[PDB]
From a paper:
We therefore reconstituted the [name]-[name] binary complex and determined the cryo-EM structures at resolutions of 3.4–3.6 Å. We modeled four [name] molecules and two [name] molecules into the EM density. The tetrameric [name] displays an elongated shape, with two [name] dimers forming a head-to-head tetramer (the four molecules are termed A, B, A’, and B’, respectively). Although each [name] dimer binds to one [name] molecule, two binding modes are found in the context of the [name] tetramer. The second binding mode involves [name]-A and [name]-B’ molecules. However, these [name]-[name] trimeric subcomplexes in the two states are nearly identical. [name] is trapped by the tip of the CTD fishhook. The H4 subdomain, along with the H3 subdomain from the adjacent molecule, brackets the β-hairpin of [name]. Notably, Tyr16 of [name] stacks against Tyr574 and Phe576 from the adjacent H3 subdomain. The H4 subdomain moves outward by ~10 Å to accommodate [name].
Residue numbers in the entry:
A (entry chain B): 22 to 142, 145 to 498, 503 to 670
B (entry chain A): 336 to 566, 578 to 787, 789 to 857, 861 to 896, 909 to 974, 976 to 1005
C (entry chain E): 10 to 120
Write the structure that this text describes.
């Protein structure tokens, strides 16, 4: 296909996915349903007025002059009677109507005066605007803007723009609807359909768009379905005037009297290309991967599981580091990316900027520990290492680190976390406020969101500590400035945490999709269900006395544990403060210790398989010890000692 | 967030900084003099609000608390599984849109997904006006869920499991599948709530979470608390929250109750509750007193808990619950309603098998519940009529492709452990085995997975009724001939149940191999002197010959005081097992190892426990336990040798 | 790959993903067959009562009648899933245990 058509299709699909697509439905689409066209009424008026018809003397202006003469001579009742006689029929909907509705358009602007495009919505709710008083009582936020006065209120001729005088006084009669149309056109992305390139409405719209500035508009798309393939000069002139033309002809080809097939071909092409990602060679693969990965570069570490959310369930990601095709039907970018990683020769086939972006992607994947696919996976070894000073517990270090001045906003965020874990919650709140205030500048906004969440978390922490720890054994310190306790109240009153993510830029909601789970307990459920299931399985093996000579299940649990901790600590998050995390850690470690103790003793391992090898073994290091000392209580330690 | 509504049925001021409207309302409802100061419209509005709060179980603040009844009840017909009621209500003409919605839910619950989808589409089309979107919205959700379920069924049904007749009959036609894909080509549910009118978004804000793909994360996360080993109660709050969720999901006719997430949540909650109860009981008995606590667990479970367990549990989950948290020490609830539930489900399975108009989706969705119900029915005391009906449904009308002979033997034997065997079920089991003899008439062979066969049934009967005689088998075997052999083979497999005349008649119908084959099943139960002479001849042949394990069984037989011969002392010399089982006093125990110890049954181990080599086995068990902490060795030591 | 191998405690046996080409006594060569063991200590048996676990042999998925249990002629073991001659290890392990049957496809716990 033509490259420009591919670009236009890609832009239309991208706009549709973001809910910024508006369809300008014309009159040909309603004609496809055999609706009586206007020229039939013009000829009927000519017959009733004069007595004989004549096709030759039918210019563009006659279509408006003849009805005006009929109204000015015969009056109003005859006009309404003819309109009622010729427009009282009901017709079935069109497949094209379903096809346009299947693209999920935010608004639908139509110049028809029919009910077909309404009766086609199937189970879709649209607020129909067809008069002046209807723009004030808009019950919803989605507009079905019938620009030219639908016949809903009746079959009288005063509710629809047909004659010439109505066309002349359109602006004075319908200011609100015109303003709404122009606002919608300026805001969203417009796709025309069912219009002739010489129609009056298109010419008027081009005349209006001439007055606008050279920049500051999005060029509307015009889908042309005419038997004759368009000429180069006409296309170039109309492109210069401010339209991007895609022609149904020169793509499918047919005879002269058929119209449904061209519309069907264009819409089927659009719908099919919607789900497809245009990937041909390595450059597109790397470009798409970088486009969908790069926002995550702000975070130091992300856990492997939620990666499956970034790619829209296109690839199941295992904890061990392998990936498995789940819901991919396209080129399979993971396969090609892994081949490029393995083979050094093919890396020379990429341009320099794509080579650099691929190098960055490879480094990021290596830091995350993503190794390879399942089939090529052999003996995979994973190391454990956390670079959080507060995790290790050398408090003099971040004491002398908070003593001096930082260098950037991220450094200040680290200072805030260190102060929060150092107990000076007053200074923590103060510096978080300083951060959220000093952040008026940001290309991502992730720091702003994370700081807001952490500020709310520490607010709840201080509130709970003050309210509860008063008679628990305190007897009184509760040391905080008296004005501060009311300042946090009045300030953090209206601030609701559920709707925080819903009120952020539309690209932030598209790029940092995983971070939404941070606002609640969601980031634990997907793992705790697996933890419970594996607990049940391991205890079943415990009771039946079965010994596994292959690879145990507990490793999976262990991996998840470490990943969670790292993602919570390398990102300097206060969410490790709650007791739900402590309970989860305690359960996982109790399971691991019990399983290791059971695997310690065996009967036939020495006599027999011992010659082949010995994989069994478990070991507590620094990490296990600090986690035990931090996330456990004395009574549970006594219980596991007894067990 | 103005007020905290605790689950038990109380309210508390949390973040209300204005006038306390809840306190004023509850004061007005508490007293009568508070009324009559308000107009007629205010009076009727207050009456309606009082009725709504009464139906929703909201009582008062926590200050005026004390002995909250907290009795739950669900009046959704689909919960109790009265399928005939749904069948008769579906055919009745519907009046309003709410009856249509309930009919759609009932049709979805019965496996008629086609009509459910069509009804949901019709409901969505018809009702779009007014602010009653609370139906419209919900309808959309249900439809979408149904569609998801449908496609999942396809990708699970036509993909794997060709055991069903044909190619699973293709339960849904291809034309409807194409129409389904066309109508839902790009339907997105995440934006359903946003596009609705702003007054709907203002009013029905609480219904947003239904459009989300996960909505049980909060309760699943809060389930962690039950693992606290440290020393209202959290069990009460967890159980009441579970009841609230179940009531909300089932009473409003929402299809999201038929998904894996809800089943997993139910199983997790129930298992954790039972584990906490058992752990608390065991800690109390260990610490407080051996019998001071009463040795009875306080976690009573009733009809609702039983039906939840039956509906949402698989076999292996119940196996885990029983081996880790044995229920035999847990007391039941109202046995009568449980009996009604069991007779209803048995009637349903009987109707399904008899009518022959089975539906594959409902088949799969119902027999899981059926197997769970019959398996769990062991722990409930049941009347004779219910036992007879359940056995009649299970033995004959349970399809072969799911329940085989062996697992049916498990179910029946597990059912009576506490129910005994009145005459009726012996009659019905005799009828079943007579029918099995009839079908044995050939290219026929019974299939079982656990290695058990029909003979066990007779043994169980002989275990419970020693003197019972089956006349029908006698009539069958009187006309029995020798042209067909498999039937007489089944007849020897059921030798003890027959009469003396039948036994003598079949004795005419039948080397060391023949004796071994007869003794394996036990036709020649006695030890005739001719058989002993054959034993001596075989032993002499072996001795002059001097390795499958066939002769150690003979030493076991002699150890059972069933071989009265003095020549067993002169055939030893090879195997330590023979010497131990014949001459244990002079036997050398250096060659003795406990590997064969895990092979004898209750009678053999009981006989050897009281025999006096006892110190040798006690020290062998001691050393084996010390080197390795084998469960079987310690268990056998405690139960047999202490 | 010995992942399949699952070793039990109350019976001391092995579970693999392999298949046996046993040869019966008297030069009776058999096709591929397999063992299934079912453990039941609560069976109320009769006067013949020594074994807690029942062992069954099936050839081609069909129950094969047993009259002369003299299959002491080894076999050619094929790892049914991956089709490998595990036979050498099969002997390695069978000569090291006292159980008459070292490998079964699965063990059914009726207890």
């Amino acid at each position: 296909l033509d490259n420009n058509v591919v670009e236009c299709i890609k832009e239309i699909t991208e706009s549709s996915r973001n809910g910024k697509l508006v369809f300008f439905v014309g009159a040909g689409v309603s004609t496809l349903s055999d609706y009586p066209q206007w020229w039939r009424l013009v000829d009927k008026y000519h017959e009733e007025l004069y007595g004989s018809p004549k096709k030759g003397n039918y210019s563009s202006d006659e279509y408006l002059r003849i009805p005006q003469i009929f109204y000015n001579v015969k009056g109003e009742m005859a006009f309404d009677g003819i309109l009622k006689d010729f427009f009282q029929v009901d017709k079935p909907t069109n497949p094209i109507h379903d096809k346009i509705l299947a693209m999920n358009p935010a608004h639908v602007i139509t110049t028809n005066y029919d009910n077909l495009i309404d009766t086609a919505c199937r189970g879709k709710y649209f607020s129909v605007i067809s008069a002046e008083e209807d723009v004030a009582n808009a019950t919803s936020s989605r507009y079905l803007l019938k620009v030219h006065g639908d016949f809903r209120k009746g079959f009288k001729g005063e509710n629809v723009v047909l004659k010439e005088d109505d066309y002349l006084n359109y602006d004075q009669n319908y200011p609100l609807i015109s303003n709404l149309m122009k606002t919608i056109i300026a805001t969203h992305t417009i796709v025309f359909i069912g219009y002739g390139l010489g129609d009056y409405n298109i010419n008027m719209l081009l005349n209006w768009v001439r007055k606008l500035q050279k920049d500051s508009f999005h060029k509307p798309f015009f889908i042309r379905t005419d038997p004759s393939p368009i000429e180069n000069e006409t296309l170039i002139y109309y492109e210069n005037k401010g339209l991007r033309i895609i022609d149904a002809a020169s793509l499918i080809d047919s005879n002269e009297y058929d119209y449904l097939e061209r519309y069907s071909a264009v819409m089927d092409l659009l719908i099919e290309s919607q789900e497809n990602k245009f990937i041909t060679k390595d450059d597109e693969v790397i470009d798409y991967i970088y486009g969908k990965i790069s926002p995550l570069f702000a975070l130091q570490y992300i856990r492997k599981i939620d990666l499956k959310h970034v790619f829209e369930y296109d690839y199941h990601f295992e904890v061990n580091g392998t990936v498995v095709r789940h819901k991919n039907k396209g080129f399979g970018y993971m396969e090609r990316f892994f081949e490029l990683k393995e083979s050094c020769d093919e890396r020379s086939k990429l341009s320099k900027k794509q080579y650099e972006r691929f190098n960055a992607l490879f480094n990021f994947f290596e830091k995350n520990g993503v190794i390879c696919m399942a089939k090529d996976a052999g003996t995979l070894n994973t190391s454990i290492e956390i670079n959080s000073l507060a995790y290790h517990g050398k408090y003099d270090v971040m004491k002398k680190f908070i003593e001096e001045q930082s260098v950037s906003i991220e450094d200040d965020y680290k200072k805030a976390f260190f102060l929060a874990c150092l107990g000076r919650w007053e200074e923590s709140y103060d510096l978080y406020s300083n951060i959220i205030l000093n952040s008026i500048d940001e290309s991502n906004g992730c720091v702003y969101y994370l700081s807001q969440i952490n500020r709310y978390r520490i607010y709840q922490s201080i509130t709970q500590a003050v309210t509860q720890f008063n008679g628990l054994g305190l007897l009184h310190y509760k040391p905080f400035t008296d004005e501060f306790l009311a300042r946090i109240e009045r300030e953090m009153t209206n601030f609701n945490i559920d709707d925080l993510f819903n009120g952020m830029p539309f690209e932030f909601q598209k790029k940092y999709k995983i971070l939404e789970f941070l606002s609640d307990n969601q980031f634990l459920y997907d793992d705790t269900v697996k933890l419970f299931e594996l607990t049940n399985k391991v205890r079943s093996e415990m009771s039946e006395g079965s010994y596994s000579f292959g690879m145990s299940s507990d490793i999976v649990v262990l991996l998840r544990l470490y990943d969670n901790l790292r993602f919570l600590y390398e990102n300097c998050l206060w969410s490790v403060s709650f007791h739900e995390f402590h309970q989860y850690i305690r359960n996982s470690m109790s399971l691991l210790i019990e399983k290791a103790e059971y695997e310690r003793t065996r009967d036939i391992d020495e006599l027999g398989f011992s010659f082949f090898g010995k994989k069994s073994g478990f070991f507590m290091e620094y990490y296990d010890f600090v986690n035990i000392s931090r996330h456990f209580k004395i009574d549970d330690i006594k219980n596991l000692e007894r067990s | 967030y103005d007020y905290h509504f605790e689950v038990n049925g109380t309210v508390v001021r949390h973040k209300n900084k204005g006038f306390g409207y809840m306190e004023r309302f509850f004061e007005l409802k508490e007293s009568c003099d508070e009324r009559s100061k308000l107009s007629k419209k205010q009076y009727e509005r207050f009456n309606a609000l009082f009725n709504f709060f009464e139906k929703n179980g909201v009582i008062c603040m926590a200050k005026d608390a004390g002995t909250l009844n907290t009795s739950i009840e669900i009046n959704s017909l689909a919960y109790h599984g009265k399928y005939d009621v749904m069948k008769k209500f579906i055919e009745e003409q519907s009046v309003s849109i709410e009856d249509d919605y309930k009919k759609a839910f009932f049709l979805a619950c019965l496996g008629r997904w086609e009509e459910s989808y069509d009804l949901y589409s019709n409901i969505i089309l018809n009702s779009i006006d007014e602010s009653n979107g609370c139906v419209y919205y919900l309808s959309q959700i249900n439809r979408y869920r149904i569609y998801q379920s449908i496609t999942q069924a396809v990708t699970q049904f036509n993909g794997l499991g060709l055991l069903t007749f044909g190619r699973h009959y293709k339960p849904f036609t291809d034309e409807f599948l194409a129409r389904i894909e066309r109508e839902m080509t790009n339907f997105n549910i995440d934006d359903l709530f946003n596009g609705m009118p702003f007054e709907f978004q203002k009013k029905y804000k609480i219904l947003e979470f239904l459009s989300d793909n996960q909505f049980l994360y909060d309760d699943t996360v809060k389930l962690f608390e039950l693992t606290n080993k440290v020393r209202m109660s959290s069990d009460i709050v967890v159980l009441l929250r579970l009841y609230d969720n179940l009531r909300f999901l089932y009473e409003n006719c929402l299809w999201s109750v038929s998904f894996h997430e809800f089943h997993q949540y139910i199983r997790n909650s129930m298992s954790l509750l039972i584990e906490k109860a058992e752990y608390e009981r065991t800690r109390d008995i260990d610490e407080l007193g051996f019998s001071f606590f009463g040795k009875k667990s306080g976690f009573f479970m009733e009809y609702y808990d039983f039906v939840n367990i039956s509906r949402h549990f698989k076999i292996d989950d119940i196996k885990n619950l029983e081996r880790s948290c044995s229920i035999d020490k847990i007391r039941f609830g109202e046995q009568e309603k449980i009996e009604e539930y069991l007779v209803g489900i048995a009637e349903e399975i009987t109707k399904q098998f008899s009518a022959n108009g089975m539906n594959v989706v409902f088949y799969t969705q119902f027999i899981s519940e059926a197997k769970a119900a019959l398996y769990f029915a062991k722990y409930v005391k049941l009347s004779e009529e219910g036992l007879g009906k359940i056995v009649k449904a299970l033995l004959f009308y349970f399809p072969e492709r799911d329940l085989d002979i062996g697992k049916r033997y498990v179910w029946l034997e597990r059912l009576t452990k506490c129910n005994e065997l009145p005459k009726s079920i012996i009659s019905i089991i005799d009828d079943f085995l007579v029918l099995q003899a009839e079908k044995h008439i050939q290219n026929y062979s019974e299939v079982s997975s656990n290695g058990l066969y029909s003979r066990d049934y007779g043994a169980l009967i002989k275990h419970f009724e020693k003197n019972f005689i089956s006349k029908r088998l006698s009539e069958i075997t009187l006309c029995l001939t020798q042209d067909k052999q498999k039937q007489i083979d089944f007849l020897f497999k059921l030798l003890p149940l027959l009469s003396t005349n039948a036994k003598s008649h079949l004795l005419s119908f039948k080397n060391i191999n023949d004796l071994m084959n007869g003794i394996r099943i036990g036709l020649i139960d006695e030890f005739t002197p001719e058989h002993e002479e054959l034993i001596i001849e075989y032993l002499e042949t072996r001795k002059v010959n001097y390795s499958n394990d066939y002769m150690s069984t003979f030493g076991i037989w002699y150890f059972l005081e069933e071989i009265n011969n003095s020549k067993m002392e002169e055939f030893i010399g090879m195997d330590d097992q023979y010497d131990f089982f014949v001459d244990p006093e002079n036997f050398d125990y250096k060659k003795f190892i406990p590997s064969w110890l895990k092979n004898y049954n209750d009678k053999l181990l009981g006989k050897i426990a009281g025999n006096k080599m006892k110190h040798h086995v006690i020290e062998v068990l001691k050393e084996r336990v010390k080197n390795s902490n084998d469960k079987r060795y310690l268990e056998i030591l405690m139960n047999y040798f202490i | 790959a010995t992942h399949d191998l699952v070793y039990h405690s109350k019976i001391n046996t092995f579970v693999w993903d392999v298949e046996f080409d046993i040869v019966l006594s008297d030069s009776k060569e058999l096709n591929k067959c397999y063992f299934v063991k079912c453990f039941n200590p609560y069976r109320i048996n009769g006067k013949c009562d020594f074994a807690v676990s029942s062992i069954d042999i099936f050839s081609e998925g069909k129950r094969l009648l047993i009259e002369n249990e003299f299959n002491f002629k080894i076999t050619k073991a094929v790892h049914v899933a991956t089709s490998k001659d595990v036979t050498e290890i099969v002997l390695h392990l069978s000569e090291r245990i006292s159980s008459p049957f070292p490998i079964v496809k699965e063990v059914v716990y009726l207890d």
